[PDB]
Design a protein around this ligand. Structure first.
Ligand code: HEM
Ligand code: HEM
Ligand SMILES: Cc1cc(N)nc(C[C@@H]2CNC[C@@H]2OCCCCCc2ccccn2)c1
Ligand SMILES: Cc1cc(N)nc(C[C@@H]2CNC[C@@H]2OCCCCCc2ccccn2)c1
Ligand SMILES: C[C@H](O)[C@H](O)[C@H]1CNc2nc(N)[nH]c(=O)c2N1
Ligand SMILES: C[C@H](O)[C@H](O)[C@H]1CNc2nc(N)[nH]c(=O)c2N1
Ligand SMILES: [Zn+2]
Lengths: 407, 411
């Protein structure tokens, strides 16, 4: 019932008790582990609210105080009467910070308590959503000195009046399938790019076109807005040694801003809750640039490096991979845009895990996502056993809205 | 019930029904996943059903399920269990069992090869000297002058648990490790404890960086005995780099034959506590883990020094750069010396083809993503993007505790 996790590099053993508070299900059973699968009423609401308010009042050292009992009382009355309830500002902020704290797939959580929370619960239209999102983008970007932020739109009611950002991230590059059957831009975004055109966007038809936002307020059909280009900090990618590198014409944006997740706090569901931090270099250099179904540039860089591409065993892909990732880090650093390398991020995460074991009794962590997509075993997380379990408040993945929306 | 897995690079989707035949436990529950945890005397009451399940699988594989031969064998085994409290496997069953334990080994990326396994039946073995001879023969056969052949040698099964056969070595061939008074380690830090046991047992240690360890062999529950593998049988490869001529002067070498000797083979409920098996290396095993783990030979600093990389910030990716060069050197060296090795790109591509084939012909392929994905360049290999289901099938290979923790010394 009390569980041990061992680091095989250091012999450090931590004991996990926090998992015993978990409530939701993993996908795993006693007979099958689904650890590598990407996606494995009034009655229901009150225990959820109580569970949350108990943890909140506990956190401010006021558990079992009159203010605790009174708030439990007030929320209970509000639920029975209105079928839902509203979080106090203090509770919203606590809940959002804890959803990040509990995100078992996030290597960046040492930072969890420094989150700027923008309360957008007074929002009523897509133009309003656009305004709030621009302000978030500008605040978060901070001229390259990135600051973590979340913007929280109104909570779900009957489920027919959802706020949604249709974009999967606030800032991404367009994808277009061309006459010769290939893809221009980001193949990840071809479907979304066409939906944007279908709704009216005028695509400049390039390789790195910042997509428009497609915003859904109150269950209405979504509307298009172009983010002010001056608000989108992009970085040209050069290499500190290879001068030909710039000729590839690659760039990436500074602000990673996930916008398709659902924030659950105390049983309430915030279906539009765009959040942002800063990049770990491998997200761009390994995944965005080198996945075969993404920009898929390994073959081009390797040719420019004059590597023996005839046999897999020359490790040409691996050599190019490293150089591509040196370039990303160098470029962001040169342009003073916050970025973190995978060695640094993972070392922070080990320090974070130790803090969480010490101060909280554990840290839910998904090793499959935490270990970086290159150089796994030379980062300390590779050797670190992790227990994965689901705590609330949480961020949950939700279906792309186009499969859901009726026009 | 049916379970689907998706490859996110190709959108290929597979359907797993094989998991329904699984009975053993994973360590996970609906409330916790233990997928990254390394480690998450039988009665007759237990033995009959396990024997039956196995013989049913065996007889199905040969297209004789329900035959007289099948029924007679069930009866024979049943009688033998109630009469002697155990039973003996037929040769054909032992072979089938060993091949299936490899086929079922969810941590093994090399399983496309599972049906080509040479099984050496050593169940007539009685002494440690006998074990030595069988292991020498295995090493010579498997090595095949660099043209490596997969093999397993199977010693007598467990009886009362007081008479176990065990190879105390974790692999047949490994290098000694020596903790120095100043706290540094000479040779392989992974093997310091075992090296100390060997020395205590009377091994004369050369005390170099790459001393092949003696075998420490326990037969029939007796105290283990030391043997030196004839050096002419131990194929090694000096490591050099195709472009960097200074690489050879690092003084590195490795052995060609990866031969796991500490696992327990379970077949039809019988336990084979000594079952050394061998294949060939994937390059990263040596170049990534053995050479670059901080707790192993830990050569990244020195290699990076000689490469004159910028070592003042981790963000120069000096570690990543040196890592790749070292792995080039390992593959080049083995290839140049005509010793079998496979790079991690080729091995993972083959594993995907194996896995899909297994889904079609068998209804699934249990696979542990945490182990299958290589320890460098993960996402540029196809297995990174492949959803896998992990579950336990028997016959199986299982971890067992090191024998020095459990052994009753006879003195
Ligand atoms: C401050 C810098 C941060 C860094 C360096 C960072 C790092 C990362 C990385 C590398 C991933 C893996 C994503 C992928 O492979 O696509 C990730 C996932 C995630 N992080 Fe962060 N993180 C940061 C901030 C945040 C913030 C501010 C939140 C929310 C407030 C957050 C919540 C998440 C969640 C929910 C996931 C899983 C996403 C999914 O399932 O698609 N992280 N983090
Ligand atoms: C023929 C070439 C083979 C290759 C290239 C190969 C590759 C590998 C690799 C890379 C691992 C992970 C090793 C590690 O990270 O330490 C592994 C694990 C394993 N393989 Fe193989 N394999 C081969 C043959 C075999 C054979 C012949 C058997 C048994 C008959 C076997 C059974 C296993 C088992 C049980 C594990 C898990 C080891 C453990 O838990 O400690 N494999 N394989
Ligand atoms: C099917 C699916 C499920 C899921 N949970 N998430 C995704 C999104 C995929 C998973 N990895 C790549 C892509 O997500 C990219 C967006 C994540 C950026 C995360 C981030 C947030 C903050 C700071 C740095 N990085 C897809
Ligand atoms: C705690 C623990 C559990 C376990 N199941 N296995 C181990 C042994 C570890 C796993 N990785 C490092 C060490 O194993 C080294 C031997 C692996 C050789 C595998 C092999 C066999 C055949 C061909 C190629 N490779 C340790
Ligand atoms: C199938 C497998 O779960 C999938 O490819 C995962 C592996 N690990 C990952 N890890 C991170 N950080 N991000 C990802 O998108 C993935 N993809
Ligand atoms: C803690 C974690 O499970 C552990 O370090 C694992 C990770 N994946 C691995 N994968 C392989 N092939 N071999 C290993 O030893 C490990 N070690
Ligand atoms: Zn699991």
């Amino acid at each position: 019932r009390f569980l041990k996790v061992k680091n095989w590099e250091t012999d450090v053993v931590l004991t996990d008790t926090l998992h015993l508070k978990s409530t939701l299900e993993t996908g795993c059973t006693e007979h099958i582990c689904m650890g590598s699968i990407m996606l494995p009423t009034k009655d229901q609401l009150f225990p959820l609210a109580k569970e949350f308010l108990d943890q909140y009042y506990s956190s401010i050292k006021r558990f079992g105080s009159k203010a605790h009992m009174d708030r439990l009382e007030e929320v209970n009355k509000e639920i029975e009467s209105t079928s839902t309830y509203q979080l106090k500002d203090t509770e919203l902020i606590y809940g959002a910070k804890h959803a990040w704290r509990n995100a078992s797939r996030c290597v960046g959580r040492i930072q969890w308590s420094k989150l700027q929370v923008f309360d957008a619960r007074d929002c009523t239209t897509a133009h309003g959503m656009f305004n709030y999102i621009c302000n978030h983008v500008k605040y978060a970007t901070n001229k390259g000195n990135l600051r973590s932020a979340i913007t929280i739109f109104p909570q779900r009611t009957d489920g027919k009046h959802d706020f949604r950002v249709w974009n999967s991230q606030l800032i991404r590059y367009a994808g277009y399938k061309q006459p010769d059957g290939s893809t221009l831009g980001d193949p990840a975004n071809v479907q979304f790019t066409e939906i944007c055109i279908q709704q009216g966007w005028k695509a400049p038809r390039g390789r790195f076109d910042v997509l428009p936002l497609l915003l859904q307020a109150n269950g209405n059909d979504p509307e298009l807005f172009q983010i002010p280009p001056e608000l989108v900090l992009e970085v040209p990618i050069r290499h500190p040694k290879f001068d030909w590198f710039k000729d590839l014409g690659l760039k990436w944006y500074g602000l990673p801003a996930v916008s398709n997740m659902l924030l659950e706090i105390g049983g309430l569901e915030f279906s539009a809750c765009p959040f942002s931090g800063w990049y770990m270099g491998t997200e761009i250099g390994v995944r965005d640039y080198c996945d075969n179904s993404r920009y898929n540039i390994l073959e081009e860089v390797a040719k420019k490096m004059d590597l023996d591409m005839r046999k897999t065993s020359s490790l040409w892909k691996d050599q190019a991979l490293v150089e591509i990732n040196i370039a990303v880090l160098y470029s962001f650093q040169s342009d003073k845009v916050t970025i973190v390398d995978h060695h640094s991020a993972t070392e922070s995460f080990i320090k974070h895990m130790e803090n969480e074991y010490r101060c909280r009794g554990g840290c839910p962590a998904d090793w499959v996502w935490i270990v970086p997509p290159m150089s796994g075993s030379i980062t300390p997380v590779f050797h670190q056993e992790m227990l994965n379990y689901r705590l609330t408040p949480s961020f949950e993945y939700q279906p792309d809205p186009w499969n859901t929306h009726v026009w």
